[PDB]
């Protein structure tokens, strides 16, 4: 006795009709959902299915360094370049690929901030089975951030706007920095 409604993407040949109580649940995993290009910067305009996302990255974007590991160091090199900057690299593990982004942003004149965050090439259900931990180290001080990996769909400009990430001013950076390099520890774990 319910009313059911076509999946959003059906205009991309999805043939599913579901009560509204349930249309999200599937609309998320609906394999017809098309993704933008995860790579920070409006440079690329590719679009394809989740599954086409990881090949796309390892095809048109080979600047992106990769690593197998559950714990690494993401070493953001030459931290003091003046203006906006972006480090990006990738971390494979648990049969998934996560994408780490350090990002400097001068969005309020004179107050330049770093904003670091992680995101899973996967869905939001998928992200939830995981936690990341970025951590900075300096002389007798440490600053650690935990969260669950953002999702390539959701993206990260809002995360970044809300400051739902790790974030630290340059003065801070300096105390954690190494010959102009900022070493970020990163561990991804399961749950």
């Amino acid at each position: 006795n319910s009313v059911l409604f076509p999946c959003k993407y059906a205009s991309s040949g999805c043939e599913i009709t579901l009560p509204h109580t349930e249309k999200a649940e599937h609309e998320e995993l609906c394999e017809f959902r098309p993704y933008s290009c995860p790579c920070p910067g409006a440079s690329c305009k590719w679009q394809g299915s989740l599954d086409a996302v990881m090949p796309h990255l390892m095809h048109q974007h080979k600047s992106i360094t990769t690593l197998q590991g559950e714990d690494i160091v993401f070493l953001a090199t030459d931290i003091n370049l003046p203006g906006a900057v972006d480090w990006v690299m990738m971390q494979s593990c648990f049969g998934f690929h996560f994408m780490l982004v350090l990002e400097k942003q001068e969005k309020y004149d004179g107050h330049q901030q770093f904003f670091a965050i992680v995101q899973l090439i996967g869905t939001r259900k998928q992200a939830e089975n995981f936690a990341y931990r970025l951590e900075l180290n300096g002389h007798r001080r440490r600053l650690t951030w935990e969260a669950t990996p953002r999702s390539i769909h959701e993206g990260i400009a809002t995360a970044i706007m809300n400051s739902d990430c790790l974030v630290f001013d340059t003065s801070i950076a300096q105390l954690f920095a190494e010959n102009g390099n900022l070493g970020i520890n990163v561990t991804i774990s399961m749950c």
């Binding site: 160091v73 953001a76 900057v85």
Partner: peptide, 11 residues
């Protein structure tokens, strides 16, 4: 001790 990825800035 972990692997290190020496990453470069872009714009």
């Amino acid at each position: 001790l972990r692997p290190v990825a020496m990453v470069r800035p872009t714009v």
